[PDB]
Design goal:
The longest helix has 15 residues, at 90-104. This protein is an alpha/beta fold. Helix 3 (90-104) packs across helix 4 (134-143). Strand 9 (213-219), helix 7 (232-243) and strand 10 form a beta-alpha-beta unit. The chain has one domain (1-273): Alpha-Beta Barrel (TIM Barrel). The chain is 29% helix and 20% strand. The chain has nine helices and ten strands. The termini are close together. The strands form two sheets. Strands 1-2-5-6-7-8-9-10 form an eight-stranded parallel barrel, surrounded by four helices. A two-stranded antiparallel sheet has the order 3-4. It binds a molecule of 4 linked components (NAG-NAG-NAG-NAG). A molecule of 4 linked components (NAG-NAG-NAG-NAG) binds at residues 9-11, 32, 34, 45, 47-48, 80-83, 125, 127, 156, 181, 184, 224-225, 255-256. The PDB classes it as hydrolase.
Length: 273
């Protein structure tokens, strides 16, 4: 399979162009659009990379196009660990979908946060807030694909199945790629010497929801998460040999680019994914 990487939450992790030119990632999720819904003005946060206000982040279009020409699919990640992002109603879902279309997809806007580049899709990283209307948002976004260009739909649900926020949305069967987060969740993550919980969790995710492919989400380094880190050798010799048996196996997802560099994770596991 391939590796999906999250980019954008640390200005020292390099440009999007450099990130994709490493030839180690097949998918890149731009994190994050952490503010929207309930009447709020949508706002993107790319840490120290750029300031979105006044088109300060429109330069990212160069990276987006550079990645795409390399066959890499780039999605705008909604949510994240921090943010007042939410959906107050089904109408709110429609408004946000149209916003995303005109500002990040095939629509039109005089203030597209990341430039004129057309992202490949939208990533759902909803970890808190509203538990409703996310399935509506998925449906509305998906409906836009009928205009000519496919709007990819991906999701980063917590490993505890089913996911409290993305369960209904994933039940629609509209998602192409689902990278489950097997960390920051003791019941379904790796523990020194024990891979039972993560494997048992993987079996539940691959034998339920209907999506294109399912990925194994992990922290790129011990510092990347509070818990759940899996040493490269363990992943390679114990975990990958098992999860890769599933026909739905898509590969591995990593948080994040910054921590991948400091730990050299993808460089160690790439070929085994
Ligand atoms: C898919 C998913 O849900 N992923 C989870 C991760 O989100 C989570 O990692 C933590 O994510 C939050 C954002 O959600 C991130 O917060 C960011 O922190 C940086 C560093 O302090 C801030 O960057 C600074 O921004 C200011 C302006 O706002 C700049 O002036 C300054 O230069 C920036 N500094 C740097 C170093 O660039 C961001 O502003 C802030 N983002 C937001 C939206 O507020 C945390 O840092 C992430 N923590 C880690 C360890 O990466 C992860 C945690 O394990 O869990 C995933 O599931």
């Amino acid at each position: 399979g391939g590796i999906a990487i999250y980019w954008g939450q640390n200005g020292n992790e390099g440009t999007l162009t450099q990130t994709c030119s490493t030839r180690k990632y097949s998918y890149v999720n731009i994190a994050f659009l952490n503010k929207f819904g309930n009447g709020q003005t949508p706002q993107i946060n790319l840490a120290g990379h750029c300031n979105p206000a006044a088109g300060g982040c429109t330069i990212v279009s160069n990276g987006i196009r550079s990645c795409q020409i390399q066959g890499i699919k780039v999605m705008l990640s909604l949510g994240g660990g921090i943010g007042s992002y939410t959906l107050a109603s089904q109408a709110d879902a429609k408004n946000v979908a149209d916003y995303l279309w005109n500002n990040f997809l095939g629509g039109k806007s005089s203030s597209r946060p990341l430039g004129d580049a057309v992202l490949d899709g939208i990533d759902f990283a909803i970890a808190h807030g509203s538990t409703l209307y996310w399935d509506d948002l998925a449906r509305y976004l998906s409906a836009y694909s009928k205009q000519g260009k496919k709007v990819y739909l991906t999701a980063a649900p917590q490993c505890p199945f089913p996911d409290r926020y993305l369960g209904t949305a994933l039940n629609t069967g509209l998602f192409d790629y689902v990278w489950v987060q097997f960390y920051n969740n003791p019941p379904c993550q790796y523990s020194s010497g024990n891979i039972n919980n993560i494997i048992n969790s993987w079996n539940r995710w691959t034998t339920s929801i209907n999506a294109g492919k399912i990925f194994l989400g992990l922290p790129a380094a011990p510092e990347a998460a509070g818990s759940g880190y899996v040493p490269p050798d363990v992943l390679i010799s114990r975990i990958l040999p098992e999860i890769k048996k599933s026909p739905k196996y898509g590969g591995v997802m990593l948080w994040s680019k910054f921590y991948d560099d400091k730990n050299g994770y993808s460089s160690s596991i790439l070929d085994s994914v």
